[PDB]
Design a binder for this molecule. Structure first.
Ligand SMILES: CCC1(CC)C(=O)NC(=O)N(C)C1=O
Lengths: 237, 300
């Protein structure tokens, strides 16, 4: 059934699973027309497909040409997401295919179920967690490859960098969700925290800075402060 | 006009014949039902006074044989049987008729209700849904499960309705996933009508039979089937005009006949709201929408 706080360690067991987040697939800017009406202009998007145990991220870039001439784009975007996830599963060797796919938004359940009919043994599951994967486009290297794409493209990353050399998957996922929640609540401040010290750099082959264990503890505390604050600044507390 | 005699009535029972019903007391001198219209299927059904659990009954067509009812004290139910000796049966009915021990099928001449509820229902198709080939009539009860229900447990006692499943490879063409799921026309017209049922009359016959089993026996899997067959048409953007017009009539008479007090259990809110207000056919069921809005506005 649904994934929630009670069954959280299941994410880090040895059954292959993928989270799919579709919140950045169909992206638009809303603007005025010369006649004073309103129109949208699409911009490139992406499917965020993540193995939470290994950190492997399959970032399928959705180029704006896929929307050309199509109607009801927000509905189509869910089906295009499911089409691309099904294609990714089929492209993987059998021993790498997931046993479960967890969708971050319940509206993806029927589209993904229908596209995965050929895979009756892959469970399609919702979740009660409010995961912050929409903030993926606040990771500069991810946003850069999406905006630069001139055609559909898949790009593979490890969203944990080399963290699993030192920490467990549970701890890595918690750090990731803390960083993304911060970036989602106050992107400017979060990015300030992460880059304030110019002596800590991001390796060419990494997404996040090369913090020592002690520096990660400081960083993580700064992100918690930010989230609680904004929660005050928001609700006034 | 045909007759279904009764050997006796040893236990107190409410007896239905189509949409009519009457109470018979224990050992009351009741010997059957006469004046049954020829040309239609019929159902004779039972609810015992001491155990309102298990409504049960028999679908039959008097053109196919001479049938009678007898109480079996071992299995504890009224059983339909066939009399092959035409003279022994004619003589028994005439004797019962002379003694005025039979109720008369109480049809009003103006009243087309039963025809309208069974227009496309044929005994030969009933006998394929309910498999018991040694009899010309078909037993159904409240508890019998459908083939589809069993998949999700005795096969000989199942209702073999045509399996309809909107999230199945049968319903969804590879490469037309979104198209086929949001517009079920290919599943309706190619898979079901052209492929399985052959024509709309057989589709409507199974839809009508499912409704009648839901209404008369409270058979839950039959209610599921009835709603699935409605939803499949309403969720198709391309349906022949004659089928939509006929569906509107079919459902109008079903909604008209339903007991007002059973609407809570026999009508699925989601299907009816989707069908009348969201689906492609939201504007094609004028008669059904009007009766539903005037009789069951709460559901909607
Ligand atoms: C002759 C008596 C009996 C008992 C079996 C019969 O032989 N045939 C019938 O058709 N009925 C209705 C009967 O009641």
């Amino acid at each position: 059934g649904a994934m929630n706080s009670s069954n959280y360690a299941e994410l880090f067991n040895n059954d292959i699973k993928l989270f799919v987040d579709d919140t950045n697939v169909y992206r638009v800017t809303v603007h005025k027309t010369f006649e004073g009406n309103v129109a949208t202009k699409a911009i490139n998007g992406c499917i965020f497909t993540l193995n939470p145990k290994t950190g492997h991220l399959f970032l399928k870039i959705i180029h704006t040409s896929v929307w050309a001439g199509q109607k009801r784009l927000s509905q189509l975007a869910k089906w295009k997401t499911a089409e691309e996830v099904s294609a990714l599963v089929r492209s993987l060797p059998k021993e790498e295919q997931p046993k479960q796919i967890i969708v971050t938004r319940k509206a993806m359940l029927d589209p993904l179920e229908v596209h995965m009919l050929d895979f009756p043994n892959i469970a399609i599951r919702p979740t009660e967690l409010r995961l912050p994967f929409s903030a993926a486009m606040s990771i500069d290297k991810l946003s850069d490859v999406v905006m630069k794409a001139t055609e559909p493209q898949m790009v593979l990353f490890n969203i944990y960098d080399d963290w699993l050399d030192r920490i467990s998957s549970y701890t890595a996922f918690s750090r990731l969700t803390l960083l993304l929640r911060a970036l989602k609540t106050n992107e400017e401040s979060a990015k300030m925290i992460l880059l304030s010290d110019p002596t800590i750099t991001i390796k060419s082959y990494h997404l996040w800075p090369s913090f020592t264990d002690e520096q990660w503890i400081t960083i993580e505390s700064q992100m918690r402060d930010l989230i609680l604050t904004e929660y005050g600044r928001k609700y006034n507390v | 006009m045909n007759t279904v005699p009764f050997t006796s009535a040893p236990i107190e029972v409410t007896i239905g014949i189509d949409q009519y019903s009457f109470n018979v007391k224990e050992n009351q001198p009741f010997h059957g039902i006469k004046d049954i219209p020829i040309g239609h299927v019929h159902v004779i059904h039972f609810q015992h006074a001491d155990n309102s659990s298990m409504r049960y009954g028999y679908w039959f067509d008097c053109r196919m044989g001479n049938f009678y009812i007898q109480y079996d004290p071992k299995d504890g139910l009224y059983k339909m049987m066939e009399e092959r000796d035409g003279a022994k049966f004619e003589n028994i009915v005439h004797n019962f008729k002379e003694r005025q021990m039979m109720v008369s099928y109480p049809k009003i001449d103006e009243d087309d209700t039963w025809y309208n509820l069974t227009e496309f229902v044929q005994m030969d198709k009933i006998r394929k849904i309910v498999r018991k080939d040694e009899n010309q009539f078909s037993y159904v009860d409240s508890s019998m499960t459908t083939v589809q229900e069993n998949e999700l447990s005795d096969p000989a006692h199942s209702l073999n309705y045509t399996v309809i499943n909107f999230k199945s490879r049968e319903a969804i063409r590879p490469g037309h996933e979104m198209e086929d799921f949001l517009d079920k026309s290919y599943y309706l017209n190619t898979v079901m009508l052209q492929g399985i049922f052959k024509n709309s009359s057989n589709y409507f016959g199974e839809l009508q039979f499912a409704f009648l089993n839901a209404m008369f026996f409270g058979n839950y899997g039959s209610s599921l089937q009835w709603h699935a067959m409605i939803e499949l048409i309403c969720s198709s953007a391309t349906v022949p005009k004659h089928m939509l017009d006929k569906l509107d009539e079919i459902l109008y008479y079903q909604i008209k006949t339903l007991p007002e007090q059973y609407s809570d259990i026999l009508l699925n809110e989601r299907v009816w709201n989707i069908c009348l207000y969201s689906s492609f056919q939201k504007n094609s069921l004028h008669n059904t929408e009007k009766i539903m809005e005037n009789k069951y506005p709460e559901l909607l």
